[PDB]
């Protein structure tokens, strides 16, 4: 599923993502926005083997399973294919682990280089909600 940019900070703020650890709801959809332009199925593979799956491109060398990348651990306790759902629901639920871990949203490489310091609330402006 390809999310309208509104339609995803509806699905999020649901979730209780808006504000969750401090983020702002601009900030995820910001996130979101350039780790998968909104796709579901988004899946990328990196450098060292693991793939990040989804609307958040979760990593498999921390956070789930998908039974190829070694050395791995599964944090969030899922499937990696769960996170292309249709259905946001693990992808947030495995996000909320992911940005309470230490690091905040810097966990997330491209938030940091895209959203970071920027007019985050822009994401959001204009949308019921
Ligand atoms: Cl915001
Ligand atoms: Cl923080």
Redesign the pocket.
């Known amino acids: 599923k390809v999310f309208g940019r509104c339609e995803l900070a509806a699905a999020m703020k649901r979730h209780g993502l808006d504000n969750y ?3 702002s709801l601009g900030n995820w959809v910001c996130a979101a926005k350039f780790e998968s332009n909104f796709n579901t199925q988004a899946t990328n593979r990196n450098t060292d083997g693991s793939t990040d799956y989804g609307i958040l491109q979760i990593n498999s060398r921390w956070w789930c399973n998908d039974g190829r990348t070694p050395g791995s651990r599964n944090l969030c306790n899922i499937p990696c294919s769960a996170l292309l759902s249709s259905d946001i629901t693990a992808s947030v639920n495995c996000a909320k682990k992911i ?1 309470s871990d230490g ?3 810097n966990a997330w490489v491209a938030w940091r280089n895209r959203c970071k310091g920027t007019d985050v609330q822009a994401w959001i402006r204009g949308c019921r909600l």
């Open positions: 650890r401090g983020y940005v690091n905040g949203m």
